[PDB]
Amino acid sequence: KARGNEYQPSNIKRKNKHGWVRRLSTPAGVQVILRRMLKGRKSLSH
Amino acid sequence: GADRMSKWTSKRGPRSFRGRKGRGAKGIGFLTSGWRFVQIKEMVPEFVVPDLTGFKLKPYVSYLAPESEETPLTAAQLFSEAVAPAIEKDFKDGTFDPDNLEKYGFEPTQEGKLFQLYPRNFLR
Amino acid sequence: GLEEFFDDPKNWGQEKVKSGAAWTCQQLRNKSNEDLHKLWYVLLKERNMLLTLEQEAKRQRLPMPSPERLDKVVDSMDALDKVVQEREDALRLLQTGQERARPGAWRRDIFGRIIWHKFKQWVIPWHLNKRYNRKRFFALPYVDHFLRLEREKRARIKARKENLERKKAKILLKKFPHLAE
Amino acid sequence: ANFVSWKSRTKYTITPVKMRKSGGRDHTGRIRVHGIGGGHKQRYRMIDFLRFRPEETKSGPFEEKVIQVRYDPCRSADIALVAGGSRKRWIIATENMQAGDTILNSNHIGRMAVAAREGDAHPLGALPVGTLINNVESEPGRGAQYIRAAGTCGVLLRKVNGTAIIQLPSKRQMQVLETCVATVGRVSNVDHNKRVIGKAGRNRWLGKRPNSGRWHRKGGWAGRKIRPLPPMKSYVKL
Amino acid sequence: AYEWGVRSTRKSEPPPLDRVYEIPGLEPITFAGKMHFVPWLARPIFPPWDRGYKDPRFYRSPPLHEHPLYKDQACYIFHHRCRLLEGVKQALWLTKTKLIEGLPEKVLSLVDDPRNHIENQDECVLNVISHARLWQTTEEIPKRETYCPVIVDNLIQLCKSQILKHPSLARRICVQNSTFSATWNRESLLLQVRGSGGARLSTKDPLPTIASREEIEATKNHVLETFYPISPIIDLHECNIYDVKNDTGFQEGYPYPYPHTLYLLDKANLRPHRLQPDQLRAKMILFAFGSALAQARLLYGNDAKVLEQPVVVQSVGTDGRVFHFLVFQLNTTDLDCNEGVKNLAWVDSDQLLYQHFWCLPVIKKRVVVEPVGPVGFKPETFRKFLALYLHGAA
Amino acid sequence: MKYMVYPQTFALNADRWYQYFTKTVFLSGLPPPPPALDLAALRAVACDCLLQEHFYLRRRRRVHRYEESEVISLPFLDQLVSTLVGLLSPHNPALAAAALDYRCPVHFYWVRGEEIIPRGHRRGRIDDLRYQIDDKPNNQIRISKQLAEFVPLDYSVPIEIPTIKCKPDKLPLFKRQYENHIFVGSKTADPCCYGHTQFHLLPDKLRRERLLRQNCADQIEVVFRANAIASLFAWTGAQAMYQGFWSEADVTRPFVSQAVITDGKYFSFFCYQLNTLALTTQADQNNPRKNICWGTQSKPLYETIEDNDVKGFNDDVLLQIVHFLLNRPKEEK
Amino acid sequence: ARNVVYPLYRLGGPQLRVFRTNFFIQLVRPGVAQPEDTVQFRIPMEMTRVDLRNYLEGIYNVPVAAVRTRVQHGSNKRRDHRNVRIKKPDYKVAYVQLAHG
RNA sequence: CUCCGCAUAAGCCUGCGUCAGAUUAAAACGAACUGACAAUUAACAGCCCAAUAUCUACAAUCAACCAACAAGUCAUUAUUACCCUCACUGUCAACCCAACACAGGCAUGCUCAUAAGGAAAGGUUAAAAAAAGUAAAAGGAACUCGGCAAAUCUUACCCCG
RNA sequence: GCUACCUAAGAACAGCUAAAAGAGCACACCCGUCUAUGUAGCAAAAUAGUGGGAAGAUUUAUAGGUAGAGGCGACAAACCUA
RNA sequence: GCUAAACCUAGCCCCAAACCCACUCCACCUUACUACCAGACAACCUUAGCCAAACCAUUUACCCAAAUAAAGUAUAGGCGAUA
Ligand SMILES: [K+]
Ligand SMILES: [K+]
Ligand SMILES: [K+]
Ligand SMILES: [K+]
Ligand SMILES: [K+]
Ligand SMILES: [Mg+2]
Ligand SMILES: [Mg+2]
Ligand SMILES: [Mg+2]
Ligand SMILES: [Mg+2]
Ligand SMILES: [Mg+2]
Ligand SMILES: [Mg+2]
Ligand SMILES: [Mg+2]
Ligand SMILES: [Mg+2]
Ligand SMILES: [Mg+2]
Ligand SMILES: [Mg+2]
Ligand SMILES: [Mg+2]
Ligand SMILES: [Mg+2]
Ligand SMILES: [Mg+2]
Ligand SMILES: [Mg+2]
Ligand SMILES: [Mg+2]
Ligand SMILES: [Mg+2]
Ligand SMILES: [Mg+2]
Ligand SMILES: [Mg+2]
Ligand SMILES: [Mg+2]
Ligand SMILES: [Mg+2]
Ligand SMILES: [Mg+2]
Ligand SMILES: [Mg+2]
Ligand SMILES: [Mg+2]
Ligand SMILES: [Mg+2]
Ligand SMILES: [Mg+2]
Ligand SMILES: [Mg+2]
Question: Which CATH code for domain D1-106?
Answer without folding.
Answer: 2.40.50.140
